[PDB]
Design a protein around this ligand. Structure first.
Ligand SMILES: *[C@@H]1O[C@H](CO)[C@@H](O[C@@H]2O[C@H](CO)[C@@H](O[C@@H]3O[C@H](CO)[C@@H](O)[C@H](O)[C@@H]3O)[C@H](O)[C@H]2NC(C)=O)[C@H](O)[C@H]1NC(C)=O
Ligand SMILES: *[C@@H]1O[C@H](CO)[C@@H](O[C@@H]2O[C@H](CO)[C@@H](O[C@@H]3O[C@H](CO)[C@@H](O)[C@H](O)[C@@H]3O)[C@H](O)[C@H]2NC(C)=O)[C@H](O)[C@H]1NC(C)=O
Ligand SMILES: *[C@@H]1O[C@H](CO)[C@@H](O)[C@H](O)[C@H]1NC(C)=O
Ligand SMILES: *[C@@H]1O[C@H](CO)[C@@H](O)[C@H](O)[C@H]1NC(C)=O
Ligand SMILES: *[C@@H]1O[C@H](CO)[C@@H](O)[C@H](O)[C@H]1NC(C)=O
Ligand SMILES: *[C@@H]1O[C@H](CO)[C@@H](O)[C@H](O)[C@H]1NC(C)=O
Ligand SMILES: *[C@H]1O[C@H](CO)[C@@H](O)[C@H](O)[C@@H]1O
Ligand SMILES: *[C@H]1O[C@H](CO)[C@@H](O)[C@H](O)[C@@H]1O
Lengths: 152, 423, 449
């Protein structure tokens, strides 16, 4: 009955795993720019607009943001050759694929549209973008609005 | 305190924000300069630079500082990189450069419109505050400091963190978003001052502590034991209480009960009026007051009394909480005795009210004719009167009292039975 | 074995243990050659894909087929997973099921279980390390226990563990390389270990089971189930049994301990033939989830000035005290054959253990056969509130008269036959609510009349 994302321990677990995965990037020998850039979601937002946007619009935008992140991560994994960095990007794809399902379990399947996009080239951007999206719109939605979404 | 002094920090071109829909940056310089010599340029990532309209203030015994607040003409975006360059215009030289995330600097304002009251039990402090900027109110953590107003200066004021529990709610909606929290262990009867501040939670928004609020004086009510409050209930349907009278004063009492210890309301506690006895039939001197009201057996009871002086001032006193089974006013027992021999007697009770009498904690004393030397006994819970000894056919008398201490109940001491001559 | 517990009431059963791995199986009594089966799978909106099946012979239930999903990206928690079982040549779906991986979790039991006698006789401190640390936030726990000498008994006495002031289902237990100087109940609290930069540590949990009967061995077992809030699943298998020997209640050796001066505590206990004993003590402030280190103890020092009195039945010992916390005590006995045993004393506050010395019994006859009783004034800080107790009898008699006055009262009064022979004796306890002292030893008997 109750959605899976509505357990706050799930969001905390996602945050802890994301920050652990970001820190692990320092360990493996080297990182080089992706030969072809990757599209990442619009994480930037202002508190002025957030307090006025309709809840349906917020859910519809955050679902599309996570989906576009997943699409970018899959393209990055497709481009990179077998190596430690590719394994880290696979493990991050696991985080993003968990996050999308957790969000769909509460917000329902709703037709997303792309926002503004930045064609990044640094592989660190994907971990950074995931962490920014998790700290931002995700926790914003699940705390400001959460108690009204989770009942029924 | 002042926000600029908390911002100053450890890095040139300091910045801070109080609501995360605003931004202020400043820096202090050793020597003054004429107008137009410097300019503050900023640019969110992927945008062309623009300028911030600066202004300046003298720094006490340290020099002069240049300050700009980001104009309302543009929106402040939080999780979005922002570059800051300060240019010497005459040289077109950058003096200080910094990279900033608006979510990475923050000095949230202290909660305005603080109010506080005496809590539910003595030593409790109720705290209520309205968020100064309500949108971010859930992304903050608060801490609290308090001290006595007499400045007795045994110690500097203590500080506690306001973590979310059953009793303390950092965030609530109210009929305007805010919070409420209950603090305990403070010394009753003495007046306190109160201060609050907050910091970003460090997960979504990151920063440090903002300025403290203005001090608010709170007059905690005294523990009612200092005025001799004693409450009791003969049966579950009615409660009676009494407290010591003062010559030049008048007083009244009130009661309340609750099932739970939730975060308190904005509105003041709604006491129910207790009703007095018939005074003139009761006691013309009225050296001690008395009051009564109907009760129940499902909840904890709280009682407050207030006294007014002939000068006109008012003081309030708060009684200790009790469960109803801790307050059973069992009547005087049916003391019974039987001599096994002249000068040696067993003691017992005339059977009645067994639902309570079978487990109560009797207590007794006795002495001889014209004497004032007291013999005593204290048997076990629910025990019979036991036994006692005396000189054969000599004059003696006894008296007893009891409390419903058998773990079926937790009652307090009842008034003594009348003294009775058994020998 | 785990495979038994996943079968339930379904034709096809899968289970995930770490929630990042997956295996699925089904049973049939018959047997088949290789290549006759495929476990096709697909998540919502994909082209079907084949699991790398392998086969296993189990005559208890015929033949069992098992696949292990590639852990890289083929396990997804909250998306629906389609499952099709069919013979590839015949091409008909024998079994079909749609599964969310988050609903079939089978958690592994905790490993490295360590347990020891707790703070009191009958307390059992358990400390365990949780496998799959990343999911330990979402688990319930269950414990079995039963005596070793009860093989006939169908009595596991299953109990469920949950968070209390004295129970901690999950903690970031402090240190891989600890030192015993660490204060009790220390754990990283809000400053959770940020990976291998600080000590990456076991993410375990530890807490006390209570109410066991002391002085004998127990076997212990532990298992877990996801709590079902967001991750749902069935109970996992039990851990392998481990045995803990609880200490016996010191009442079985007549342990008594007390202080006469609020600064030095004297303890005494009996002894047996061909045995010897030694004493220990400790202090602790509050009940809380213990650390992994064994409790610290300090030796007690013998009373003997070499007196020669030879009360060979009892050992008596002393140590200096403090009044900031409750006190614990321990006694160990050694056999002639070298074996050792442990006894644990009941804890007390120091003021519940104050045995003020024998009172200054005083008496004065108001008349022949009627006398008041009182005390020679001394030790007023304690004597003013202590609960005196007395008894007396006649010459050569064994019939006892008794008195017990109020808390802190004088000796009161007594009556007797005029000029007949009588004698009395008294003892006291510091029962006045300023203190809670126990019964002190009796004063010497005196022929007060
Ligand atoms: C909460 O308090 C009420 C009173 O305000 C309790 O009501 C009590 O109810 C019992 C029966 O349930 C009554 O017992 C009866 O007593 C008469 C003698 O008075 C006896 O002859 C009958 O055979 C019967 O035993 C009782 O009188 C009544 N009041 C009191 C003071 O006991 C109520 O029981 C309380 N709540 C709970 C959960 O018990
Ligand atoms: C905790 O325990 C300590 C001892 O273990 C208690 O200290 C005792 O305190 C009393 C009252 O202050 C002392 O009596 C006083 O002794 C001085 C001489 O030192 C004398 O001049 C005074 O007239 C008075 O009799 C007593 O000596 C002292 N005992 C020891 C062994 O030092 C203490 O009271 C306990 N409680 C607290 C809260 O500390
Ligand atoms: C200042 O110098 C920079 C190069 O360092 C140049 O791009 C900029 O245009 C100069 N300022 C103005 C006002 O032209
Ligand atoms: C002493 O009292 C003053 C207020 O008069 C206060 O500012 C100061 O902190 C106090 N110091 C201590 C040590 O309590
Ligand atoms: C296999 O079974 C499916 C489902 O009934 C059917 O559509 C298909 O024609 C069969 N044969 C092949 C070669 O797929
Ligand atoms: C046998 O059962 C009794 C219960 O009647 C129990 O007390 C005893 O410990 C058991 N002994 C064994 C060896 O199982
Ligand atoms: C009854 O009354 C006595 C005082 O006379 C208390 O000290 C006791 O605790 C009980 O409440
Ligand atoms: C003193 O000693 C008696 C036994 O003689 C105990 O039963 C009592 O509780 C107190 O500790």
């Amino acid at each position: 009955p109750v959605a899976p994302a509505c357990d706050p321990r799930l969001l905390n677990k996602l945050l802890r795993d994301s920050h652990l995965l970001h820190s692990r990037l320092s360990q493996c020998p080297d990182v080089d720019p992706l030969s072809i850039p990757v599209l990442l979601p619009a994480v930037d937002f202002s508190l002025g607009e957030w307090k006025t946007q309709t809840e349906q619009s917020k859910a519809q935008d955050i679902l599309g943001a996570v989906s576009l992140l997943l699409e970018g991560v899959m393209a990055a994994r497709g481009q990179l050759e077998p190596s430690c960095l590719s394994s880290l990007l696979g493990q991050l794809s696991g985080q993003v694929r968990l996050l999308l399902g957790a969000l769909q379990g509460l917000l329902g399947t709703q037709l997303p549209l792309q926002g503004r996009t930045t064609a990044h080239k640094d592989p660190n951007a994907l971990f950074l973008s995931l962490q920014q999206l998790l700290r931002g719109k995700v926790r914003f939605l699940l705390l400001v609005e959460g108690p009204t979404l989770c009942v029924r | 305190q002042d926000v600029f002094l908390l911002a100053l920090g450890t890095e040139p071109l300091n910045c801070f924000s109080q609501t995360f829909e605003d931004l202020t940056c400043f820096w202090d310089e050793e020597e003054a300069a004429p107008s137009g010599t410097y300019q503050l340029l900023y640019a969110y990532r992927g945008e062309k630079p623009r300028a911030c309209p600066l202004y300046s203030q003298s720094v006490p015994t340290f020099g002069t500082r240049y300050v700009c607040q980001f104009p309302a003409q543009d929106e402040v975006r939080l999780f979005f990189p922002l570059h800051l360059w300060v240019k010497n215009v005459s040289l077109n030289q950058t003096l200080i450069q910094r990279v900033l995330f608006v979510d990475s600097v923050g000095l949230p304002a202290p909660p305005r419109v603080i109010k506080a009251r005496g809590g539910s039990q003595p030593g409790e402090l109720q705290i209520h505050w309205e968020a100064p900027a309500p949108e971010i109110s859930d992304f903050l953590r608060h801490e609290l400091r308090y001290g006595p107003t007499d400045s007795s200066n045994a110690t500097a004021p203590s500080v506690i963190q306001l973590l979310s529990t059953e009793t303390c709610c950092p965030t609530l909606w109210m009929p305007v978003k805010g919070g409420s929290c209950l603090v305990s262990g403070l010394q009753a009867g003495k007046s306190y001052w109160l201060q609050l501040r907050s910091q970003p939670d460090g997960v979504s928004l990151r920063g440090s502590w903002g300025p403290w609020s203005f001090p608010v004086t709170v007059d905690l009510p005294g523990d009612a034991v200092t005025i001799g409050l004693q409450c009791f209930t003969l049966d579950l349907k009615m409660v009676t209480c009494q407290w010591q009278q003062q010559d030049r004063t008048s007083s009244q009492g009130f009661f309340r009960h609750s099932r739970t210890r939730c975060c308190p309301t904005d509105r003041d506690p709604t006491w129910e009026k207790c009703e007095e006895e018939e005074p003139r039939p009761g006691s013309q001197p009225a050296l001690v007051s008395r009051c009564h009201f109907k009760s129940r057996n499902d909840s904890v009871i709280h009682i407050l009394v207030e006294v007014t002086t002939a000068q006109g001032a008012v003081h309030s006193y708060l009684g200790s909480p009790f469960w109803i089974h801790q307050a059973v006013l069992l009547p005087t027992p049916s003391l019974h005795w039987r001599e096994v021999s002249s000068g040696r007697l067993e003691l017992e009770w005339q059977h009645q009210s067994s639902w309570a009498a079978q487990e109560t904690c009797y207590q007794l004393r006795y002495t001889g004719e014209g004497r004032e030397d007291w013999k005593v006994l204290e048997p076990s819970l629910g025990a019979r009167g036991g036994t006692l000894e005396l000189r054969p056919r000599a004059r003696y008398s006894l008296q007893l009292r009891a409390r419903l201490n058998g773990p079926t109940y937790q009652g307090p001491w009842s008034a003594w039975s009348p003294p009775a001559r058994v020998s």
